[PDB]
């Protein structure tokens, strides 16, 4: 009765539902609906003060699913949670959605790497893909769990929306100067390196393709026996060697290195965030600050930036953080002359 | 001295070295400021 | 000195260039 299910279940159809198929689909579906549902129908100004959905008229960009209220900490307020008391409508008013999406959605990510392992032992392929996938999953937990945990509550976690994400970015720039963190820098390295590879590899191929392979001279053909494939490593090599100066020519390395760059990066970036979770940042250069105070005729871009930040913080924290209730008198605000 | 459970051959090639150093120095460069300041 | 150290690690990254581009191991089809 077991093995049968194994097979019925693992039966090779259009959409492969494996053993993992049970976690993945129920969770990855609800995590999607959860978004789309609130996105289109819920308001989060009882909890955040802003407009959450389309029901109030936000554009796609503006609309999002906002985080619970800071007064609640990390209480997973599920429908039967002592706080919502089973009343759905309010369970939504309070943001009980965020938790929904992140949790179900956390498992969908669990299911998707599991489904990536299944398929590799049925087909008999390497598990590598399933491993490359850890980076995003890291980034995810790093972001939406670790970080909110370290801080005051769920509120400070990214908000599920478009703009609501841009606001995240900026937030980080002001209080953390995340851009100065070295970890985000490396992360910034792989992502841009992933795209640099994606271009050179894809262009080199396409352009070194074998001559006359098609009389008509367009390129829409292949076959299994086409063992050699459509292009030259020998020419690419020399091409690069004489243009760029370097070119390790060994296909197997080229592709793996293409795993290393992107993925290696996001792991750092995720590390970098486990750090901020604890307000532990790379927001300062003692050496400079010191000479920055004992002397007023000395300035560097390091400094000019630290100024913008305070501007971000002063103006953006009273509307952005409703719970403390900041009252800041016009004069008080930092402000360059004439603006 | 007389055990054979081990495959006793360790290798790194010319190329692997270049990338090895390119990483350590670049890596060092970056962090330098942070250790220092 | 905070300096020479950013320079030192610099001259190496250029020394590594020359040596990597002009003294690399050959890519041959003798196979």
């Amino acid at each position: 009765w077991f093995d049968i299910l194994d097979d019925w279940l693992k039966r090779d159809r259009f959409v492969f539902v494996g053993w993992s198929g049970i976690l993945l689909f129920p969770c990855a579906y609800l995590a999607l609906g959860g978004w789309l549902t609130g996105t289109t129908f819920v308001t989060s100004w009882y909890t955040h003060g802003l407009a959450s959905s389309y029901l109030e008229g936000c554009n796609f960009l503006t609309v999002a699913v906002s985080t619970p209220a800071n007064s609640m900490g990390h209480s997973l307020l599920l429908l039967w949670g002592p706080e919502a008391q089973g009343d759905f409508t309010r369970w939504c008013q309070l943001g009980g959605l965020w938790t929904f999406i992140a949790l179900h959605g956390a498992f969908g990510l669990i299911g998707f790497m599991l489904r990536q392992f299944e398929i590799a032992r049925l087909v008999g392929v390497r598990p590598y893909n399933a491993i490359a996938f850890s980076a995003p999953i890291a980034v995810f937990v790093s972001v939406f769990l670790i970080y909110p945990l370290g801080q005051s509550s769920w509120f400070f976690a990214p908000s599920f929306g478009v703009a609501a994400i841009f606001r995240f970015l900026l937030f980080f720039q002001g209080f953390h100067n995340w851009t100065l963190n070295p970890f985000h820098m490396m992360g910034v390295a792989g992502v841009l390196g992933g795209a640099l590879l994606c271009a050179i590899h894809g262009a080199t191929v396409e352009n070194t393709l074998f001559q006359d392979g098609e009389g008509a001279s367009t390129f829409r053909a292949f076959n299994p026996t086409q063992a050699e494939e459509t292009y030259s490593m020998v020419t690419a090599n020399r091409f690069w060697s004489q243009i760029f100066g370097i070119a390790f020519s060994n296909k197997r390395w080229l592709h793996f290195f293409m795993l290393f760059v992107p993925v290696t990066g996001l792991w750092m970036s995720a590390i970098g965030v486990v750090g901020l979770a604890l307000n532990l940042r790379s927001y300062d250069f003692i050496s400079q600050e010191i000479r920055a105070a004992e002397d007023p005729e000395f300035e560097t871009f390091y400094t000019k930036n630290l100024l913008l930040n305070e501007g971000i913080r002063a103006w953006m924290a009273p509307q952005d953080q409703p719970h403390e209730n900041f009252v800041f008198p016009e004069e008080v605000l930092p402000r360059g002359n004439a603006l | 001295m007389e055990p054979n459970p081990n495959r006793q051959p360790v290798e790194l090639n010319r190329t692997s070295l270049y990338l090895g150093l390119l990483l350590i120095l670049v890596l060092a460069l970056l962090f330098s400021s942070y250790f220092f300041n | 000195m905070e300096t020479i150290t950013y320079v030192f690690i610099f001259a190496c990254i250029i020394a590594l260039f020359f040596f990597a581009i002009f003294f690399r191991e050959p890519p041959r089809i003798t196979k």
């Binding site: 003692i286 050496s287 400079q288 010191i290 000479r291 | 360790v10 290798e11 790194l12 090639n13 010319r14 692997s16 070295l17 090895g20 150093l21 350590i24 120095l25 890596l27 060092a28 962090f31 330098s32 250790f35 220092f36 300041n37 | 000195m1 905070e2 150290t5 690690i9």
Partner: peptide
């Protein structure tokens, strides 16, 4: 300026150990 002198030793060892390390292995290779 004011810098923590331990950086030097830190940043120098970062340069050497992993490097020395690899230098030993590229010789055994040949």
């Amino acid at each position: 300026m004011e810098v923590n002198q331990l950086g030097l030793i830190a940043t120098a060892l970062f340069v050497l150990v992993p490097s020395v390390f690899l230098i030993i292995l590229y010789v055994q290779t040949e």
